[PDB]
Coordinates of C-alpha atoms in Angstrom, one line a residue:
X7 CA 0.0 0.0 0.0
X8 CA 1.0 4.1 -0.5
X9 CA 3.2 4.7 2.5
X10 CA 1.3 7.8 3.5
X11 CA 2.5 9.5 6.7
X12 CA -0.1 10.0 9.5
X13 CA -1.6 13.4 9.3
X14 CA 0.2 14.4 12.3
X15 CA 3.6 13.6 10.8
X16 CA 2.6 15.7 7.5
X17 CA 1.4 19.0 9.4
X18 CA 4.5 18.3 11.6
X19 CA 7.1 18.1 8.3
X20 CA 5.3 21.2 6.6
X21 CA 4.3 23.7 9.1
X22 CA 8.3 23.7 10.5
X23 CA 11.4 23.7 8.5
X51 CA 8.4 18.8 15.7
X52 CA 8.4 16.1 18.1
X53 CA 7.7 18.6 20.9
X54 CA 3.9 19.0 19.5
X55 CA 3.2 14.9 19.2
X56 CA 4.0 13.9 22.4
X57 CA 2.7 15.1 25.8
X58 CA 5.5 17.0 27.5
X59 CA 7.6 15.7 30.0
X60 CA 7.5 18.8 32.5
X61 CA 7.5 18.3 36.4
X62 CA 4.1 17.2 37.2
X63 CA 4.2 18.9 40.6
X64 CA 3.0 22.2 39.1
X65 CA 1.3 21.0 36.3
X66 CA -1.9 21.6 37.7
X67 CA -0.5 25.2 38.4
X68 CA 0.6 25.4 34.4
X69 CA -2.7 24.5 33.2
X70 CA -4.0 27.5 34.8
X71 CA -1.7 29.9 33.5
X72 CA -1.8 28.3 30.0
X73 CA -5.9 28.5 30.0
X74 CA -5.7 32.1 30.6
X75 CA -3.4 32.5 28.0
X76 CA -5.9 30.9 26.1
X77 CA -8.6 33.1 26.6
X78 CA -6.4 36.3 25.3
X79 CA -4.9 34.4 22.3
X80 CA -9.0 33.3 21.2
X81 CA -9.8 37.0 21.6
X82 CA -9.3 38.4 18.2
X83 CA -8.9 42.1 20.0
X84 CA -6.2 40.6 21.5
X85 CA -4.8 38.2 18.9
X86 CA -4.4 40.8 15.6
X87 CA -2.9 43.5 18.3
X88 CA -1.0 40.8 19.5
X89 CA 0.8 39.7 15.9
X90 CA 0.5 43.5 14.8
X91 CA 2.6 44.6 17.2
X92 CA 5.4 41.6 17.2
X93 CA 6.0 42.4 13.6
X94 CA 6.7 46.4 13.9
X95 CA 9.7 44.7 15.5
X96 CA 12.8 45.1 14.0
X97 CA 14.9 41.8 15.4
X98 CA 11.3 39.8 15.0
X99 CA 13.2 37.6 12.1
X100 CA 11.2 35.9 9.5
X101 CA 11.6 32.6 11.0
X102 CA 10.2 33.8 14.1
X103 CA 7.4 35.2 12.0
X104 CA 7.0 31.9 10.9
X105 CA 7.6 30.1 13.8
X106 CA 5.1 31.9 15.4
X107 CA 2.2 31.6 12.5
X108 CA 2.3 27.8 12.7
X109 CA 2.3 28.0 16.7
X110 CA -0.8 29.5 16.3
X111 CA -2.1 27.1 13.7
X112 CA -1.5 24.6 15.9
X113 CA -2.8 25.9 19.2
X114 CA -5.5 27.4 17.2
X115 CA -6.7 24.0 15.3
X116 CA -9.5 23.0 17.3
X117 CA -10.4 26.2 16.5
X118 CA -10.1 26.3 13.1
X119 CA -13.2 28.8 12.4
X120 CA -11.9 31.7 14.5
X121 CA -8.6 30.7 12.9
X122 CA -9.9 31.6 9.6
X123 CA -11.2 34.7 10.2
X124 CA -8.2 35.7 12.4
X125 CA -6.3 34.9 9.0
X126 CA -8.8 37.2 6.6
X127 CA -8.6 40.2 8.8
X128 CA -5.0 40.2 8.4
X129 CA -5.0 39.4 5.4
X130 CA -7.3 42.4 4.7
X131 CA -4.8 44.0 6.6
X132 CA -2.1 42.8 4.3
X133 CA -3.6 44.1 1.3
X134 CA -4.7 47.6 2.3
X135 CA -1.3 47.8 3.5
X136 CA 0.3 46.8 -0.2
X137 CA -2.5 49.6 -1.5
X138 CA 0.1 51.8 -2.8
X139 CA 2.5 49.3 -4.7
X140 CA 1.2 46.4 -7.8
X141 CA -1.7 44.6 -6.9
X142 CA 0.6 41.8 -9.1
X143 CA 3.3 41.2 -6.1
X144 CA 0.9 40.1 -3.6
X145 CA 1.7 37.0 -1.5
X146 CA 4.1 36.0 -3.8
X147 CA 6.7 35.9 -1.1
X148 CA 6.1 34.3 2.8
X149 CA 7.9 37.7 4.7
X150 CA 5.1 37.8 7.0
X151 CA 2.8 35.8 9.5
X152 CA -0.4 36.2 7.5
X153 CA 1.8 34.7 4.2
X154 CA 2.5 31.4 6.3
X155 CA -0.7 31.3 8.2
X156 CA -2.1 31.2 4.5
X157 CA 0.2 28.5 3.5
X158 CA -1.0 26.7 6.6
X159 CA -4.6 27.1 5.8
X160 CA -4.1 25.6 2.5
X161 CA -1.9 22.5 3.9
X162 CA -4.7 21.7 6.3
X163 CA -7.4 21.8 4.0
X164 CA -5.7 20.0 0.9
X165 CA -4.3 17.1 3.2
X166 CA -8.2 15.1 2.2
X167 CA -6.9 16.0 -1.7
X168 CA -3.7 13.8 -1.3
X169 CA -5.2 11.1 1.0
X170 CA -8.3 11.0 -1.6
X171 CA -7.0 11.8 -4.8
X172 CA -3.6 12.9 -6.0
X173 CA -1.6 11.1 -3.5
X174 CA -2.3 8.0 -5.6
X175 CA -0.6 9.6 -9.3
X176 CA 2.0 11.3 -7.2
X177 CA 3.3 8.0 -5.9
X178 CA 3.0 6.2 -9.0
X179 CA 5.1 9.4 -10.9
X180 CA 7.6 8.8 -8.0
X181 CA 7.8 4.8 -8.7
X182 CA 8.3 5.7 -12.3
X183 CA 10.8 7.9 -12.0
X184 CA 12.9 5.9 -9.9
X185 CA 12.4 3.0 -12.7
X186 CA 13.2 5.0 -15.4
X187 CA 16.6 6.3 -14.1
X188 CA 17.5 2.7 -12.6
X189 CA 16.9 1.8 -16.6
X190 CA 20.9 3.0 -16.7
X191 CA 24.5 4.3 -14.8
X192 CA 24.7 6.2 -11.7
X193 CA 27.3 7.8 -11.0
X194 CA 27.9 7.0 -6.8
X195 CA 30.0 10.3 -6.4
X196 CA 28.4 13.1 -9.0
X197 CA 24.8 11.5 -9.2
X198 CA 24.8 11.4 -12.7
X199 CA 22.8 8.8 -14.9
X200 CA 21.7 8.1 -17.8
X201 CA 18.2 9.0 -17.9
X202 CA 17.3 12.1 -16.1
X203 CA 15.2 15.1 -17.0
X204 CA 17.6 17.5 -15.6
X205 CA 20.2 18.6 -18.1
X206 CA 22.9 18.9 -15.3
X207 CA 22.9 15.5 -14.5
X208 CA 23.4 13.6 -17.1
X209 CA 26.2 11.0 -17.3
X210 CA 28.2 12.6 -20.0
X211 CA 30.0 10.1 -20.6
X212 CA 29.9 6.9 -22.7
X213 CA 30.4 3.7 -20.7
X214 CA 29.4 0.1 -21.7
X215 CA 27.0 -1.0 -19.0
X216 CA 24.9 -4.2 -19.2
X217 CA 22.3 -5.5 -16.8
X218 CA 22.6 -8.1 -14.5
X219 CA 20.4 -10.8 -12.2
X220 CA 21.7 -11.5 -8.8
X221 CA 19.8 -14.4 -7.2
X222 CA 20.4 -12.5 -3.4
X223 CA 19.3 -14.0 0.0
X224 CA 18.5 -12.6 3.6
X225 CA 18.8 -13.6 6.3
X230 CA 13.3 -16.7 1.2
X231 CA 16.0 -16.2 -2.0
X232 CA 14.6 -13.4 -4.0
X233 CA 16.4 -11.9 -7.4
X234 CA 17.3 -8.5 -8.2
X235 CA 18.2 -6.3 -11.5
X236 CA 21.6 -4.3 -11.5
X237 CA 23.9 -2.6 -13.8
X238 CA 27.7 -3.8 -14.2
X239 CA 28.8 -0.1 -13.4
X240 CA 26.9 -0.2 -9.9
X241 CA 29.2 0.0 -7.2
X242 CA 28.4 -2.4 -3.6
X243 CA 26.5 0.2 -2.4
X244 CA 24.1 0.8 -5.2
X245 CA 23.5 -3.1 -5.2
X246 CA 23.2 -3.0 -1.6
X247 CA 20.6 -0.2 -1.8
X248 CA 18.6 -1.9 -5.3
X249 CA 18.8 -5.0 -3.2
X250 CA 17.0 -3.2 -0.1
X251 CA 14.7 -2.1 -2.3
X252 CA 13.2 -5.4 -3.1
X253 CA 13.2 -6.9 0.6
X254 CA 11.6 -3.9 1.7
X255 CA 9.0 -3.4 -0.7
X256 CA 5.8 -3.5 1.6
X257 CA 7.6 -1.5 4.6
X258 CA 7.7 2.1 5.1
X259 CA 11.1 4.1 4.1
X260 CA 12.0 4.7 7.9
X261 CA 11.6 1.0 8.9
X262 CA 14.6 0.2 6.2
X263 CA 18.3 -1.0 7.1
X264 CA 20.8 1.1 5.2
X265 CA 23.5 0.1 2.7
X266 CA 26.5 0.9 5.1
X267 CA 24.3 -1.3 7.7
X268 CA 24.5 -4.5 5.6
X269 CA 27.2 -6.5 4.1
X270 CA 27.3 -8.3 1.0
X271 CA 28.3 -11.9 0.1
X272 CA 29.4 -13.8 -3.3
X273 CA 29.7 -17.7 -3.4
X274 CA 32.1 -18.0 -6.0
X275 CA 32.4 -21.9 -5.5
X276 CA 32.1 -24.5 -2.6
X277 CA 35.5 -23.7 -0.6
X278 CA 35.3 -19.9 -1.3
X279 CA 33.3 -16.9 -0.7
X280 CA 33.6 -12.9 -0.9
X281 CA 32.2 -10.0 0.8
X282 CA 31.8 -7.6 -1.5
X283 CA 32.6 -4.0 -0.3
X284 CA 32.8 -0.3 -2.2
X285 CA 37.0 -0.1 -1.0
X286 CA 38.7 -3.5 0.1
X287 CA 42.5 -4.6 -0.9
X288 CA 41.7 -5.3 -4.8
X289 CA 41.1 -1.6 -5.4
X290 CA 42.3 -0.3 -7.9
X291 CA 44.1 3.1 -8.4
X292 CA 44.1 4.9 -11.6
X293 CA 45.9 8.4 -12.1
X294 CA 46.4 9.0 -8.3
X295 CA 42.5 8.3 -7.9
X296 CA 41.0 5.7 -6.7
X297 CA 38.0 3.5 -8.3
X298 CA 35.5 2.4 -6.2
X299 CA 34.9 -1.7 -6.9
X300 CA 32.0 -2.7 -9.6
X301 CA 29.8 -5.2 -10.0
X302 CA 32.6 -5.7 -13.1
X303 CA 35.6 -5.2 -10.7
X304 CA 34.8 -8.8 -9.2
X305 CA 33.6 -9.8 -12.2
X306 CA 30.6 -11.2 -10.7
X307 CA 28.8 -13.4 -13.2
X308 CA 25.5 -13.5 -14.3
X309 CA 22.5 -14.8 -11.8
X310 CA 25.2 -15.2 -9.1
X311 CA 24.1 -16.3 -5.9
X312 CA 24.9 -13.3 -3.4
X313 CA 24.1 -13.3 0.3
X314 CA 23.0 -9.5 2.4
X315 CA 23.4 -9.8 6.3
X316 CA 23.6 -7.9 9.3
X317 CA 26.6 -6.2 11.1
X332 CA 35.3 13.7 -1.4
X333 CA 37.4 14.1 -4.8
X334 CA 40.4 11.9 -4.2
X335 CA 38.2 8.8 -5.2
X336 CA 36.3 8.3 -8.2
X337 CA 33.6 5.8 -10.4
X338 CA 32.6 6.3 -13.7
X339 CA 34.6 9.9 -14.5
X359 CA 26.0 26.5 -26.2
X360 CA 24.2 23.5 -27.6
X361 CA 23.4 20.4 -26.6
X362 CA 24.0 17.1 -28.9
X363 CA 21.3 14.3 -29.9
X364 CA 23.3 11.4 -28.4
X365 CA 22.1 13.4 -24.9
X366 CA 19.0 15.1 -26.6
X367 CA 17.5 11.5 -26.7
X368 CA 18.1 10.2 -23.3
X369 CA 16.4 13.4 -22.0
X370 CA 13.4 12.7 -24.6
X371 CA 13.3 9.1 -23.4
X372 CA 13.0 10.0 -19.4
X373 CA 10.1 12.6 -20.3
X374 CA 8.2 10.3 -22.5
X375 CA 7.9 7.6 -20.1
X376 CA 6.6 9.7 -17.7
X377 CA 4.2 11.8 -19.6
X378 CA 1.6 9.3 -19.1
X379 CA 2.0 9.7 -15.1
X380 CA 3.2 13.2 -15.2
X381 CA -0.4 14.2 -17.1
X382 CA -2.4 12.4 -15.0
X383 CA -1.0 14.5 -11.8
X384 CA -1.7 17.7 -12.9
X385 CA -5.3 16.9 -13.8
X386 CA -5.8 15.5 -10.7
X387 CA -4.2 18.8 -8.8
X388 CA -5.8 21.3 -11.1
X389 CA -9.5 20.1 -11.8
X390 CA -12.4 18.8 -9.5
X391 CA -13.5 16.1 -8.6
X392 CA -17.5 15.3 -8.9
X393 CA -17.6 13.3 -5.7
X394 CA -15.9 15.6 -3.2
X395 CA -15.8 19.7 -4.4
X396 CA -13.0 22.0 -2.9
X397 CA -15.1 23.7 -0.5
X398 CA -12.2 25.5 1.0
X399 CA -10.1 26.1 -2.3
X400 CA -13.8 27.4 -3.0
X401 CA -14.2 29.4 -0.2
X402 CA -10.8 31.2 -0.4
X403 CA -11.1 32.2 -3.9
X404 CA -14.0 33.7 -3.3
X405 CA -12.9 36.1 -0.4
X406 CA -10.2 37.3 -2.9
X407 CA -12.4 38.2 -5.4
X408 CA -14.8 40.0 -3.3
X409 CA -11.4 41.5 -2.1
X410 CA -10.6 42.5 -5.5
X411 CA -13.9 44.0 -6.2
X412 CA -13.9 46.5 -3.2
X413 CA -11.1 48.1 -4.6
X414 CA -11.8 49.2 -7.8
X415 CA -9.5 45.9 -9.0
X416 CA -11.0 44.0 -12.5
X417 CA -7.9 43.3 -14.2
X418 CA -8.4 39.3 -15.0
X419 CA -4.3 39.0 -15.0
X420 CA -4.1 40.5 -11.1
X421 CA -7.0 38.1 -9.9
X422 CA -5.0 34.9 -11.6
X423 CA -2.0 35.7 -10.0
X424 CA -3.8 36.1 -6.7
X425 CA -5.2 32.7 -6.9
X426 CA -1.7 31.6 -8.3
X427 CA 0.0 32.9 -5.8
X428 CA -2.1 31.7 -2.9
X429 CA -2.9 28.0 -3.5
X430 CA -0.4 26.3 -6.4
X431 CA 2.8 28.1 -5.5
X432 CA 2.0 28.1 -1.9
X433 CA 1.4 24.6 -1.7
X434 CA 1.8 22.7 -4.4
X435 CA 5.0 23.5 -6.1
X436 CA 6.5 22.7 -2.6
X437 CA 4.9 19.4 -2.1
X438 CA 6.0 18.7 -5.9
X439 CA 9.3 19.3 -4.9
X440 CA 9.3 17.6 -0.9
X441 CA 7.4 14.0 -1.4
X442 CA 8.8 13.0 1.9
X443 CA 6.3 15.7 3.4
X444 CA 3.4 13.0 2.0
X445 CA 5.2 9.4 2.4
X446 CA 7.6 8.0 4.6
X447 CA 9.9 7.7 1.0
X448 CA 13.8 8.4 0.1
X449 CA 15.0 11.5 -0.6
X450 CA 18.0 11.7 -3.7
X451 CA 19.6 14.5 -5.2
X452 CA 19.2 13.1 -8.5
X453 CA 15.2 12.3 -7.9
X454 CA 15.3 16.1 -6.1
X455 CA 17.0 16.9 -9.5
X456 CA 14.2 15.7 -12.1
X457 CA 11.6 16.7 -9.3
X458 CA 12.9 20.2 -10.0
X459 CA 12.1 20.2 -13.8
X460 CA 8.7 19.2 -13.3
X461 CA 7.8 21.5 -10.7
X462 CA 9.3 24.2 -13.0
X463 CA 6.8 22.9 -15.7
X464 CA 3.7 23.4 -13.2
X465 CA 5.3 26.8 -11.8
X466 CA 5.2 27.8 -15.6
X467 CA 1.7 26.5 -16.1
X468 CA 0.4 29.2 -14.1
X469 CA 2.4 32.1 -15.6
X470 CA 0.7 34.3 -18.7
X471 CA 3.7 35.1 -20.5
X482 CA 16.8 23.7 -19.4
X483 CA 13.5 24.9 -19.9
X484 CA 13.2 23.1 -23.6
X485 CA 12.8 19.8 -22.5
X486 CA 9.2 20.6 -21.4
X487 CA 8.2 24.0 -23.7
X488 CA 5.5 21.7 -25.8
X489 CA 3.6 20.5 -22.8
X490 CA 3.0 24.1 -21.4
X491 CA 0.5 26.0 -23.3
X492 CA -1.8 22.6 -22.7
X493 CA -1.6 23.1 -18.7
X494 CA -1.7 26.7 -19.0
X495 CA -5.7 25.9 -20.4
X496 CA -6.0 23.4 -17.7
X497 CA -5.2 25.7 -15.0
X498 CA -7.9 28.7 -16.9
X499 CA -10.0 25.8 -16.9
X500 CA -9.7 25.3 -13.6
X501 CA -10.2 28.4 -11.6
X502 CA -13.1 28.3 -14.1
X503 CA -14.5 25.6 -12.3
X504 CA -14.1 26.6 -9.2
X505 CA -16.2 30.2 -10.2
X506 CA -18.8 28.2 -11.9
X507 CA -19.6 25.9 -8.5
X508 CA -22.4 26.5 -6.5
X509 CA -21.4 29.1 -3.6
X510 CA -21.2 27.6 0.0
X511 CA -22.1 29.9 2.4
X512 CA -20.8 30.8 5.7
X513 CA -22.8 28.1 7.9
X514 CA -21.5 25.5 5.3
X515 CA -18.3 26.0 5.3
X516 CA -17.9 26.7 9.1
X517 CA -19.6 23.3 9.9
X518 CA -16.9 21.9 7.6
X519 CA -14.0 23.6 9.7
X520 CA -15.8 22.5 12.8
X521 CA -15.8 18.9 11.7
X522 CA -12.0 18.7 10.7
X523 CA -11.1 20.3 13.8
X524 CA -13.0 17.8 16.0
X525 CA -11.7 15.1 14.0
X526 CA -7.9 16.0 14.8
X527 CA -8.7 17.6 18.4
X528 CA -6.4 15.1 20.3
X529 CA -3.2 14.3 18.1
X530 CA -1.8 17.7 18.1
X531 CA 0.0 18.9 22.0
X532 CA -1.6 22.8 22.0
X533 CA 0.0 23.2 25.9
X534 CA 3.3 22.7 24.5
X535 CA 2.2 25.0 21.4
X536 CA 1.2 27.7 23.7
X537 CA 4.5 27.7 26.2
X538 CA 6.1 28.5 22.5
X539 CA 4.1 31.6 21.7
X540 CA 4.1 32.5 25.5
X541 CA 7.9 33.2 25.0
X542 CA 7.0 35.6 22.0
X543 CA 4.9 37.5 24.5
X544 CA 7.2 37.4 27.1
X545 CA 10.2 38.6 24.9
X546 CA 8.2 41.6 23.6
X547 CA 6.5 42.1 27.2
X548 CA 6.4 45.7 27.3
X549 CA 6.0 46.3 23.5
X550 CA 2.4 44.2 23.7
X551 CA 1.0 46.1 26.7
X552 CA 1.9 49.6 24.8
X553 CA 0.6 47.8 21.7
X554 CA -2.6 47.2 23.9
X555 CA -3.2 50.2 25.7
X556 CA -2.9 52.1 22.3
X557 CA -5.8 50.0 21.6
X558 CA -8.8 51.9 22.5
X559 CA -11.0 48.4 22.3
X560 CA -8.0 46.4 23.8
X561 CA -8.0 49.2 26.6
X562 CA -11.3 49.5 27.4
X563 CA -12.0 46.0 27.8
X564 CA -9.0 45.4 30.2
X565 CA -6.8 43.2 28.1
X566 CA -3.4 45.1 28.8
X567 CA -4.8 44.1 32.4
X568 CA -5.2 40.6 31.2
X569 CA -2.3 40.2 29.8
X570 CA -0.7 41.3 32.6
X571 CA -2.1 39.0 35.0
X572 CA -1.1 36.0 32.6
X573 CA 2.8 37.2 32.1
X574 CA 2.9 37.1 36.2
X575 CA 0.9 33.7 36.4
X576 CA 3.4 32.4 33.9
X577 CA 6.5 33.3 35.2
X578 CA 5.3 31.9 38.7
X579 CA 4.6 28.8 37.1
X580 CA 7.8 28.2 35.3
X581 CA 10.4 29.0 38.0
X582 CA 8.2 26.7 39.9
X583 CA 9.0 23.4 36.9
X584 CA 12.5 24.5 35.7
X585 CA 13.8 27.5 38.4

């Protein structure tokens, strides 16, 4: 089955560049019924929104608040704030209104194109949340399958161990530029059931070890795998004699003050040989205007495996599926088009790159580019590589004006994508109550994976560190004032910092 990671696990890998917020914090549990106080208080300010946008408003007139702390601090508050996710959303609008009054005077074109501010990452937050059900439903399935293919194709030919460079590969940068005779072999291997794997002559003991993994480990999640520098590998050559087979060993070779790392060749290991896995820089080398067709080809090759797979996951990421409608992709597309309206702002171009710039370049282009953010999978700089041309292709997919390989495909998802946030104006409007009740329900679905205590001990130090900024901020808030919440705030910073001399001191 897809190896998809536990929702937890994705929110955890996306929202922070954290064990902390999964588990239940280990704190004394003397004055634990002393920090649940001072945390529910804190509570009660941080789900005020008089308190909340004066709160964030005020942290980021700051000139040492650094935009990882601004981050940091919008997917604290997505996290403490998902049980609430309705009076998250609206907390998120308003500044977001905020956001775009503010950018009033420069081109309506460079909005949220960037993530320089908490509203940017509580947006790309939102959207993470709400297109987790897309993955799990929908696209997770092509995704995976593009992945599988990809790997395949690549493992068709050479790798280079050191440079990473093959001989498919959709990235012009990587490929093997050089011409080395490389035929497959069968290795009947064994583990301590004798299974058989595919290799390449030119594969070092590592990249066996790793294609040999591969097949052991097929139904187990990526984390659960032994590693190549774990295992060992064993030839049986005859009856009296065996070999472990190692990357460096005495029979290496040296060659022009550089040393080869041993093949599958270097041993001459025959064809179908019986091999046995078990338990236990630049001084050394393997294989070491316009572009020729002998390359040309091999790049043509790679792409038009692939198209098949590659096709099917746009369509599934930019159209909508009968069965289940994108009430949220919906419902934010909406607010910026009654957004644009208000202020005199009909240019068709402005209001794509709005929709652009808040939903497939927010979200997408980075989960193109991160699969390990969706399944417990390898990562590879070569797989990063090709991964890096095709999120290019969908990043230019949702323009309106290396990059050859693809230049066909383009003006096709370009339609796609019109066609798309055509579908999503043509669907039926939810309202409010609708798409509230929806919020409500995902929130009461994940109410007791995610640690909000820990969550808001993290913000609390925000507060702390900008103490005396937050009740000027406050009391220069005629609401804020008037309803006591410099006074509340207040009482909370001295309930705190009882509690935690009383746990740590």
């Amino acid at each position: 089955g897809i190896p998809f990671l536990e929702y937890k696990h994705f929110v955890t890998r996306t929202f922070f560049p954290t064990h902390p917020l999964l588990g239940e914090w280990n704190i004394p549990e003397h004055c634990r019924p002393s920090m649940e106080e001072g945390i529910s208080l804190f509570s009660s300010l941080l789900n005020n929104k008089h308190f909340l946008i004066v709160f964030v408003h005020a942290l980021e007139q700051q000139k040492d608040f650094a935009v990882r702390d601004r981050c940091s601090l919008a997917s604290l508050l997505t996290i403490a704030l998902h049980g609430k996710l309705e009076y998250y959303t609206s907390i998120m609008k308003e500044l977001l209104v905020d956001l775009i009054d503010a950018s009033a005077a420069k081109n309506p074109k460079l909005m949220l194109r960037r993530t320089e501010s908490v509203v940017e990452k509580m947006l790309t937050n939102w959207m993470s949340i709400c297109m987790y059900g897309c993955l799990r439903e929908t696209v997770g399935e092509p995704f995976f399958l593009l992945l599988c293919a990809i790997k395949q194709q690549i493992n068709k030919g050479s790798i280079d161990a050191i440079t990473g460079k093959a001989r498919y590969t959709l990235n012009e940068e990587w490929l093997l530029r050089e011409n080395i005779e490389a035929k497959p072999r069968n290795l009947n291997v064994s583990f301590q059931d004798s299974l058989s794997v595919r290799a390449m002559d030119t594969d070092t003991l590592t990249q066996v070890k790793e294609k040999i993994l591969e097949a052991f480990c097929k139904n187990v999640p990526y984390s659960q795998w032994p590693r190549a520098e774990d295992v060992d590998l064993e030839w049986f050559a005859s009856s009296t004699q065996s070999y472990v087979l190692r990357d460096l060993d005495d029979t290496s070779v040296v060659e022009d003050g550089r040393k080869k790392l041993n093949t599958l060749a270097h041993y001459k290991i025959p064809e179908g040989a019986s091999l046995a896995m078990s338990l236990t820089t630049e001084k050394y080398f393997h294989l070491v205007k316009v572009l020729p067709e002998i390359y040309l080809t091999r790049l043509l090759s790679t792409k038009g495996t692939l198209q098949k797979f590659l096709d099917d996951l746009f369509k599934a990421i930019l159209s909508i599926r009968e069965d289940k409608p994108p009430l949220a992709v919906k419902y934010f597309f909406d607010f910026l088009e009654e957004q644009a309206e208000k202020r005199g702002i009909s240019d068709p171009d402005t209001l794509h790159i709005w929709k652009t710039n808040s939903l497939p370049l927010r979200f997408w282009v980075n989960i193109l580019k991160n699969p390990q953010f969706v399944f417990d999978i390898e990562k590879t700089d070569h797989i990063d590589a090709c991964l890096s041309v095709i999120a290019q292709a969908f990043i230019d997919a949702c323009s309106i004006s290396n990059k050859l390989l693809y230049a066909k495909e383009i003006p096709e998802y370009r339609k796609t994508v019109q066609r798309y946030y055509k579908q999503i104006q043509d669907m039926t409007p939810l309202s409010e109550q609708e798409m509230n009740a929806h919020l409500a329900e995902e929130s009461r679905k994940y109410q007791n994976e995610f640690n909000t205590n820990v969550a808001m001990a993290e913000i609390y130090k925000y507060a702390k560190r900008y103490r005396p900024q937050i009740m000027a901020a406050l009391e220069a808030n005629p609401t804020a004032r008037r309803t006591q919440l410099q006074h509340k705030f207040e009482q909370v910073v001295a309930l705190m910092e009882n509690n935690i001399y009383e746990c740590y001191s």
